[PDB]
Ligand SMILES: CC(=O)N[C@@H]1[C@@H](O)[C@H](O[C@@H]2O[C@H](CO)[C@H](O)[C@H](O)[C@H]2O)[C@@H](CO)O[C@@H]1O
Ligand SMILES: CC(=O)N[C@@H]1[C@@H](O)[C@H](O[C@@H]2O[C@H](CO)[C@H](O)[C@H](O)[C@H]2O)[C@@H](CO)O[C@@H]1O
């Protein structure tokens with residue numbers, strides 16, 4: 001249940017509900033993977049969705065149009081969230097977009113099924129831990145919800 005399907009063949013930004021910031025992937029400067037206020041659009045904020053197959057049918061890899069890297073989310077090692085080359089070579093590259101309901105209609109969690117984690121974008125901690133993850137079979141918080149933007 002609750003599968004969300006992003007559009008294919010068009011780049012999008014991923015904006016956090018709690019943070020009003022969009023994820024990004026860049027090779028420089030550090031941090032390479034972080035988030036940015038949504039009012040400022042930059043190349044590093046654009047991603048496409050890569051459909052999965054087999055065990056990963058209904059899941060997607062999230063590929064940066066700026067670096068070519070896909071996002072990952074794992075419980076260990078550190079860093080727990082980041083990016084890596086390829087088109088989803090590793091299990092922790094495969095996300096179920098888990099559709100929200102109620103006040104979360106229109107939004108989804110980004111659930112890395114293989115690592116049992118969800119992505120987090122928040123402003124309630126220092127910048128070193130604002131873009132992170134949380135166990136997926138635990139409490140749900142607004143900072144785990146994202147939506148897709150085309151501007
Ligand atoms: C740790 C931290 O808060 N760093 C930010 C930088 O990321 C940010 O740099 C901009 O980031 C956007 C991301 O889409 C573009 O890459 C842009 O070109 C960068 O300048 C700067 C400036 O906003 O602020 C902090 O340093
Ligand atoms: C900061 C950074 O990105 N370091 C990378 C590690 O992430 C990477 O570890 C692998 O990452 C993939 C991500 O999909 C899987 O989690 C895999 O199991 C990890 O071993 C290592 C090795 O490629 O390289 C850097 O340290």
Ligand SMILES: CC(=O)N[C@@H]1[C@@H](O)[C@H](O[C@@H]2O[C@H](CO)[C@H](O)[C@H](O)[C@H]2O)[C@@H](CO)O[C@@H]1O
Pocket residue numbers: 120122124129132133134141143144
């Ligand atoms: C680095 C690290 O693992 N820090 C964790 C925090 O992220 C975690 O904070 C919770 O995170 C969720 C994420 O959806 C919400 O932001 C929630 O409000 C936070 O309490 C805390 C508590 O579990 O543990 C570490 O500090």
